[PDB]
Design a binder for this molecule. Structure first.
Ligand code: DGD
Ligand code: CLA
Ligand code: LMG
Ligand code: SQD
Ligand code: SQD
Ligand code: LHG
Ligand code: LHG
Ligand code: BCR
Ligand code: BCR
Ligand code: LMT
Ligand code: LMT
Ligand code: LMT
Ligand code: LMT
Ligand code: OEX
Ligand code: CL
Ligand code: CL
Ligand code: FE2
Lengths: 34, 39, 38, 35, 31, 30, 39, 341, 334, 63, 78, 36, 31, 39, 30
């Protein structure tokens, strides 16, 4: 269903925005805690 | 006026034998009079 | 073997796999990563 | 200073706030349904 | 049997009240 | 139901007897 | 604004409060329009 | 260090949200119950179970949305998503009222988890577990009302619906069909709740108005320190005030606070007992002596008999819509009503 | 010195076992009058024609009532809001038949409780306390005034005051719901929050204090004996209570200031009861609870029911039966 | 501590006060039996509840 | 008194939080919006649309009556 | 009835006058703190 | 009024028995 | 066998306030339930 | 005659009140 695609795409976009703006420090923290 | 402790007050006692005697008296009086109370 | 019997057994299996032992695995993993320093 | 970013508190916050904002958007949209 | 409708209350109280009087006096004895 | 009352008072007397014998105040020489 | 690198917390509070007021205002408006309005 | 000790350490870490072992039961079940209620009130209808709209999507508001009880046709079926009714169909599961047992059972286990949490945290910090004991009251209410009452009745349909107006409907239903106000157990519940509110108000005010002068500000709130050893208000002055105003007064602080626990908790427990009675239609509905006298004396009228008449009216006018599965057809002429109304 | 001064020092004396005070000089007579009349009427009052239709209602124990069903019946609808003291009746029997005892008891009781609130202020002033316990007591006073005076005033008759009885109270509530939908009134919802939350906070506060009691006794005796009246030290560990509660929910939701905590305990039920008293007082002017009857229509225009419609059905069932002989005309406006 | 003949007969049964198995002991097996008990109770509940329908009988007075 | 986590005020007054959230929060808002406004919610939850409470053949309340075959019952209700 | 009305009027008037003249008798002075 | 013929005995005992329990305990206290 | 005094026995107490509270509780419970006992 | 029972219980409660006020255990500072 296309309705599924258009209801999901905002969620995905929020996910990628958060990732691209937090990922360096998030991976830093993940590695530090091993 | 002032409330002063009363020095005439005394303990009351009922020893165990007196308890048994009184309980028996009460029980037998009940046995006796219950039939007449019911009539 | 009735459909409701199959669904009950499937409920046991899926309850385990979906809740009981991703949660146990995650809890064990994290407790052994972030460990209290005495 | 220099605290962790993701924690149990982070998850507790989002587990509530994320579906909350989703639901609020849904209800806002409902405000414009016509019979 | 058509007995007096106050018989049960009369008999029970007749026994009970002196019973608790004696019980009170005995139990408090030695206070 | 007045039978219940009669049985009750009789049982009260009998219980008093058993307690007065078994749990009597012991006579003590002093 | 008054300090560089951070938003004052009162500004954040004002903005979030206005957003919340707008959300509740939209819900009250919808009480009178569309579904559930008795019209 | 065994794996169990390591897990125990991680679960009991001092963090913003304490988890504990009880959290393993509390948080998923509580989240399920809360999210189920929110989902149902936002999206899910009661059209097929009650013939009612009960969600925001249908146009209902906060006061009129509910997670409505399931259809009476299912009796006391637990209505698992995988059960013989829904058979794994989520849409159908929503439509038959499957969300109601979902919320009720997850809420019951969440309540268990929360009280286990009270026990666990009390044990960890080294205090007596009287908070959990106090919470037993709300648990008794939830168990009696949301589980035992429908279990004694024909089905889950007659359980209270999780909603504001649904609860109001349950309340009025119990008045009209059970005469619940006449029930002495409910009156003890009311006494406990109103007494708890009274104790809360009077204790708060008494403390706030017998405070010691421990600061210089008109703002008395910062003349207290959590580590201070001395009482912050004058118990002696409070006791004298209430002795002269009311005749009696607390003189023991510990008894005072135990009483503040005791009153509402006992109220909840007594009302739960009454609800258990109503589950089996064991009502305090009537006073037979007054019924007989009124039946033979058409000039005997009391407030009790007037209330009986009100109950009859409510039942007749409400049953066809409240119990749609019964197909009650009450023609206009059989409805009781006074003159001109 | 003077006789009047001596009397003043006696009335305002803090050494009296029961404080009298100037408000007490009104409270005591009115409250005693109300109590004596209430007891006499509740035991032995003859039936009262509350609805003014020559349909007397038996309220007293001697006329067939039990404690649950007994009441002091509100005065007749024919009286309306007229003042009906004993001396305006042709005889005591007429006064009784028309519900005069209700007016006597209610008016004296209301004066008494307002004077009780003033007396609370007065004693707080004489003892050097802060003055606001009477403010807390103003909530139950407001509620009682709403149900005994304000609602009859707005409705235009003391027959529509709350009866002085248990079953009479229930009748009052049921009719009130039928006519005003008080359950769907937000001020009554605030009252429910007030009392539910007040009981909740009473249970939490008592349980947290009891939970954090400092060990001062043995396992045999009551822990209550660990507290001595007038002791300076604190009897429980508020820091331990805060640790427990701030871990039960989270740190910043827990009071650690006892003064703020006790202010919250006072304020929550009092505010809730003020709101519910105002709810009754404004429903006295027929500003009723929310009406969502037929608020949801389908696309064609057929009404879709909600729980509010079921509630309305129950209300109608109550409405058509209440005071079954009193209405001549189709609309229940009075 | 009065001795009686029956007391001496019963003495070895009340002699192991406080003796424990170090560590976790049989706790895993206990947990396994508890899980099996829970599944059994679920089965009989769902049968009684008519949420688990088996062939060969009906939950009804007729059998 | 901090249990270790960053204080909320510090986080929500920081620029990075707002760079993240001026996007994330509106996206969930309009995702819920689209959930409603596309009709997905009706079909997912089985909630009738305003024109589907009654059909041209069913003018009465579709009250479920059968104990185990509700799928067919709902289908015949339409 | 008239005797009753007169008696009640006198009783009530006396109690009200008591209350009024009592609060006029320098009542703010009757406290354990400051008397100015 | 045709009331339950066990009402008087039930009510009187319901009050009386706990009353004498409390009375006994209070009076003996301090023994 | 010998009859030895039991060292576990303890006094019971009910203070005056507890007496008043219990008597009031009993009285109000009687008030509440008497009507239902009579029916 | 159930009026007698009602009056009896009510009078019991009132007597308890009077004794609990007049003959209360005095609060004493020690
Ligand atoms: C303390 C609290 C701590 C917190 C705990 C929270 C967690 C709770 C987890 C428990 C969940 C309980 C689910 C209850 C299921 C149930 O009961 O469901 C009901 C079923 C029985 O099914 C019912 O049976 C009834 C009678 O049927 C029988 O009679 C019918 C008419 O003749 C037919 O002939 C039919 O074929 C025949 O089976 C009707 O059919 C009902 O429609 C049907 O629902 O019992 C059963 O599964 C099992 C019955 C035995 C166990 C009952 C335990 C619960 C008891 C509650 C009290 C019961 C009554 C007193 C009320 C007050
Ligand atoms: C699960 C059972 C349950 C729940 C959740 C509720 C909930 C509610 N009831 Mg109800 N009620 C119930 C059972 C329940 N009731 C039963 C069995 C009866 C008798 C039949 C009633 C009779 C009743 C009446 C007559 C009324 C209510 C009302 C209310 C509302 C206010 C109540 C209140 O403040 O009290 C006190 C509780 C507190 C002061 C503590 C706060 C509790 C809040 C709600 C906790 C929420 C915390 C947070 C928001 C959760 C999110 C997590 C967070 C970290 C983000 C509330 C939403 C009122 C209403 O309808 O309002 C519109 C009202 O008029 N109830
Ligand atoms: C970010 C994170 C925030 C975290 C939140 C955590 C979760 C909280 C969930 C609890 C809220 C539950 C109530 C939702 C109300 C709602 O959605 O109404 C949504 C409705 C929508 O309004 C209705 O919409 C319909 C659409 O078809 C129709 O248009 C109706 O006519 C219209 O009335 O708004 C109202 O009903 C008006 C009043 C709304 C406010 C009521 C709140 C009362 C609160 C009571 C106590 C609870 C408090 C919880 C919080 C503290
Ligand atoms: C999401 C993480 C929440 C789950 C959790 O338990 O923490 C797991 C921890 C995070 O919190 C960790 O959590 C700890 C605090 S607490 O347990 O969250 O309370 C903290 O000690 C640690 O430094 C921190 O990294 O592991 C991480 O550091 C990985 C970061 C996640 C990046 C991928 C996305
Ligand atoms: C969503 C919520 C989910 C919640 C999840 C909770 C997380 C898991 C908590 C588990 C706690 C219960 C076990 C307690 C630990 C223990 O008993 O000893 C720990 C032992 C001792 O081992 C070893 O033994 C050594 C010696 S001894 O133990 O002293 O004997 C010891 O030194 C060493 O430490 C130890 O490694 O270690 C184990 O490996 C035994 C595991 C057995 C656990 C019970 C199994 C029951 C669950 C299965 C359910 C399905 C069954 C099938 C049904 C069809
Ligand atoms: C303001 C209105 C409320 C008045 C306070 C009511 C308390 C009654 C109890 C009296 C004894 C309690 C008592 O003695 O109080 C004592 C307490 C402390 O007094 P202090 O002397 O320290 O300070 C008061 C002044 O003397 C100096 O500021 O007083 C206050 O804190 C006043 C706070 C007012 C702020 C309250 C705001 C409430 C608004 C929210 C209401 C909305 C609810 C509905 C939501 C929809
Ligand atoms: C205007 C002044 C005149 C007063 C008239 C009003 C009388 C009110 C006096 C209260 C009586 C005390 C009863 C408790 C017996 C008593 O003396 O308690 C005394 C008690 C004092 O407790 P302490 O702090 O001393 O306790 C320490 C330990 O000893 C605990 O036992 O007060 C309380 O417990 C408060 C909680 C109970 C509050 C009960 C109030 C109930 C209200 C009345 C309800 C019955 C009405 C029925 C009508 C038919
Ligand atoms: C159902 C189900 C489930 C679950 C789910 C979940 C768990 C979810 C969820 C969810 C959620 C969790 C949601 C949410 C939400 C929300 C909302 C809807 C909100 C709101 C709100 C409001 C409206 C508020 C307002 C306000 C006020 C009033 C006060 C102040 C201001 C403010 C703004 C805050 C599953 C799938 C598992 C399975 C199947 C069934
Ligand atoms: C409370 C709170 C909060 C919030 C707040 C908010 C959310 C808001 C607000 C507010 C606002 C938002 C405001 C405003 C305003 C404005 C004004 C006040 C104005 C004015 C003016 C005028 C007067 C006008 C005039 C005119 C006219 C007359 C006509 C011509 C023209 C004009 C218009 C000029 C915070 C967080 C902070 C803190 C805590 C809590
Ligand atoms: C801060 C909180 C407030 C922020 C959100 C409020 C937004 C304010 C209005 C935004 C614009 C409204 O935009 C509105 O979109 C809806 C989508 O349902 C359209 O609605 C139209 O299509 C929808 C869905 O197909 C039908 O349900 C509806 O009956 C029909 O009118 C309206 O024609 C348009 O007016
Ligand atoms: C703490 C424990 C919590 C317990 C609950 C946790 C969630 C449990 C959800 C279990 C859901 C059971 O869901 C059930 O899955 C089975 C297995 O795929 C589905 O079964 C489906 O696939 C299987 C095989 O793939 C076919 O034989 C079957 O005919 C078909 O229906 C059921 O139709 C569905 O109802
Ligand atoms: C916030 C969460 C919201 C809840 C979820 C919202 C989405 C709703 C899901 C509806 C999806 C489709 O819903 C419809 O019903 C269920 C979904 O289980 C499926 O049902 C099918 O699979 C199940 C599971 O094995 C079996 O019982 C059987 O094979 C059949 O019933 C249908 O094939 C699907 O068409
Ligand atoms: C200390 C405070 C001061 C106390 C002083 C006040 C004393 C009391 C004064 C009350 C005056 C009596 O009030 C008087 O009542 C009589 C009753 O016959 C009224 O009389 C009128 O109504 C009555 C009915 O009640 C008729 O029977 C009568 O024929 C008619 O004249 C008068 O109109 C009124 O003047
Ligand atoms: O009086 Mn007692 O309630 Ca007031 O509404 Mn009209 O008036 Mn009668 O009718 Mn419904
Ligand atoms: Cl009526
Ligand atoms: Cl009319
Ligand atoms: Fe306190």
């Amino acid at each position: 269903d296309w309705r599924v695609i258009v209801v999901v795409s905002p969620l995905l976009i929020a996910a990628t925005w958060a990732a691209i703006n937090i990922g360096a420090a998030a991976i830093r923290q993940l590695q530090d805690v091993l | 006026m002032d409330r002063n402790s009363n020095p005439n007050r005394q303990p009351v006692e009922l020893n165990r034998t007196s308890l048994y005697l009184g309980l028996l008296l009460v029980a037998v009086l009940g046995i006796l009079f219950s039939s007449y109370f019911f009539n | 073997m009735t459909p409701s019997l199959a669904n009950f057994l499937w409920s046991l299996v899926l309850g385990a796999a979906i809740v009981l032992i991703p949660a146990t695995v995650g809890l064990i993993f994290i407790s052994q990563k972030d460990k209290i320093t005495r | 200073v220099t605290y962790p970013i993701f924690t149990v508190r982070w998850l507790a916050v989002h587990t509530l706030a994320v579906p909350s904002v989703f639901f609020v958007g849904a209800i806002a949209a409902m405000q414009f349904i016509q019979r | 049997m058509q007995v007096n409708n106050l018989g049960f209350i009369a008999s029970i109280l007749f026994v009970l009240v002196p019973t608790v009087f004696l019980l009170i006096l005995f139990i408090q004895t030695g206070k | 139901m007045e039978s219940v009352a009669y049985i009750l008072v009789l049982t009260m007397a009998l219980a008093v007897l058993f307690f007065a014998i078994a749990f009597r105040e012991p006579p003590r020489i002093e | 604004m008054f300090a560089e690198g951070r938003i004052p917390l009162w500004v954040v509070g004002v903005v979030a409060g206005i957003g919340a007021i707008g959300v509740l205002g939209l819900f009250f408006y919808g009480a009178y329009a569309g579904l559930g309005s008795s019209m | 260090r065994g794996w169990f000790d390591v897990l125990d350490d991680w679960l009991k870490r001092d963090r913003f949200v304490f988890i504990g072992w009880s959290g393993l039961l509390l948080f998923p079940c509580a989240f399920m119950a809360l999210g189920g209620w929110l989902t149902g009130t936002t999206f899910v209808t009661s059209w097929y179970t009650h013939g009612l709209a009960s969600s925001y999507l249908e146009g209902a508001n906060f006061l009129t949305v509910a997670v409505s009880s399931p259809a009476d046709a299912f009796g006391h079926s637990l209505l698992f998503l995988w059960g013989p009714e829904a058979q794994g169909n989520l849409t159908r599961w929503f439509q038959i009222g499957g969300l109601w047992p979902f919320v009720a059972l997850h809420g019951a286990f969440g309540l268990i988890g929360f009280m286990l949490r009270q026990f666990e945290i009390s044990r960890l910090v080294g205090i007596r577990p009287y908070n959990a004991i106090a919470f037993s009251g709300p648990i008794a209410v939830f168990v009696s009302v949301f589980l035992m009452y429908p279990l004694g009745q024909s089905s889950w349909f007659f359980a209270p619906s999780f909603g504001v107006a649904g609860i109001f409907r349950f309340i009025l239903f119990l008045q009209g069909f059970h005469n619940w106000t006449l029930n002495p157990f409910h009156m003890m519940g009311v006494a406990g709740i109103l007494g708890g509110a009274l104790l809360c108000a009077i204790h708060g005010a008494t403390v706030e108005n017998t405070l010691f002068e421990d600061g210089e500000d008109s703002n008395t709130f910062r003349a207290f320190e959590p580590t201070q050893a001395e009482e912050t208000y004058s118990m002696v002055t409070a006791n004298r005030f209430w002795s002269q105003i009311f005749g009696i007064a607390f003189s023991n602080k510990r008894w005072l606070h135990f009483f503040m626990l005791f009153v509402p908790v006992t109220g909840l427990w007594m009302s739960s007992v009454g609800i258990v009675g109503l589950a089996l239609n064991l009502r305090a509905y009537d006073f037979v002596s007054q019924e007989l006298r009124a039946a033979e004396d058409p000039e005997f009228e009391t407030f009790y008999t007037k209330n009986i008449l009100l109950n009859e009216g409510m039942r007749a006018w409400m049953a066809p819509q409240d119990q749609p599965h019964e197909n009650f057809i009450f023609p206009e002429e059989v409805l009781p009503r006074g003159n001109a109304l | 010195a003077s006789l009047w001064e001596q009397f003043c020092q006696w009335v305002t004396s803090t050494n009296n076992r029961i404080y009298v005070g100037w408000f007490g000089t009104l409270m005591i007579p009115t409250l005693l009058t109300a109590t004596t009349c209430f007891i006499i009427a509740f035991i032995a009052a003859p039936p009262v024609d509350i609805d003014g239709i020559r349909e007397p209602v038996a309220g007293s124990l001697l006329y067939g009532n039990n404690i649950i069903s007994g009441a002091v019946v509100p005065s007749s609808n024919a009286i309306g809001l007229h003042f009906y003291p004993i001396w305006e009746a042709a005889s005591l029997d007429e006064w009784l038949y028309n519900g005069g005892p209700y007016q006597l008891v209610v008016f004296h009781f209301l004066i008494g409780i307002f004077c009780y609130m003033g007396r609370q202020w007065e004693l707080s002033y004489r003892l050097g306390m802060r003055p606001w316990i009477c403010v807390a007591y103003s909530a139950p006073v407001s509620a009682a005034t709403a149900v005994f005076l304000i609602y009859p005033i707005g409705q235009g008759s003391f027959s529509d005051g709350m009866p002085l009885g248990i079953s009479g109270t229930f009748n009052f509530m049921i009719v009130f719901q039928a006519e005003h939908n008080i359950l769907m009134h937000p001020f009554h919802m605030l009252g429910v929050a007030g009392v539910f939350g007040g009981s909740l906070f009473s249970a939490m506060h008592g349980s947290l204090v009891t939970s954090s009691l400092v060990r001062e006794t043995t396992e045999v005796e009551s822990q209550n004996y660990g507290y001595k009246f007038g002791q300076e030290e604190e009897t429980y560990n508020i820091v331990a209570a805060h640790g427990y509660f701030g871990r039960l929910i989270f740190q910043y939701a827990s009071f650690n200031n006892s003064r703020s905590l006790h202010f919250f305990l006072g304020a929550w039920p009092v505010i809730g009861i003020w709101f519910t008293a105002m709810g009754v007082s404004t429903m006295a002017f027929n500003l009723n609870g929310f009406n969502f009857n037929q608020s949801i229509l389908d696309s064609q225009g057929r009404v879709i029911g909600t729980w509010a419609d079921v509630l309305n059905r129950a209300n109608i069932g109550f409405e058509v039966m209440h005071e079954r002989n009193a209405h001549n005309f189709p609309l229940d406006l009075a | 501590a009065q001795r009686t003949r029956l007391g001496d007969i019963l003495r070895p049964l009340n002699s192991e006060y406080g003796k424990v198995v170090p560590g976790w002991g049989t706790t895993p097996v206990m947990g396994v039996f508890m899980a099996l008990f829970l599944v059994f109770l679920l089965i009989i509940l769902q049968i009684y509840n008519s949420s688990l329908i088996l062939e060969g009988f009906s939950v009804d007075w007729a059998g | 008194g901090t249990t270790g986590e960053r204080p909320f005020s510090d986080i929500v007054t920081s620029i990075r939080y707002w760079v993240i959230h001026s996007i994330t929060i509106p996206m969930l808002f309009i995702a819920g919006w689209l959930f409603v406004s596309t009709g997905l919610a009706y079909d997912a939850f089985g909630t009738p649309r305003p024109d589907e409470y009654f059909t041209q053949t069913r003018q009465e309340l579709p009250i479920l009556q059968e104990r185990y075959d509700i799928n067919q019952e709902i289908q015949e209700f339409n | 009835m008239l005797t009753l009305k007169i008696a009640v009027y006198i009783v009530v008037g006396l109690f009200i006058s008591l209350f009024i003249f009592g609060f006029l008798s320098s009542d703010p002075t009757r406290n354990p703190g400051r008397k100015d």
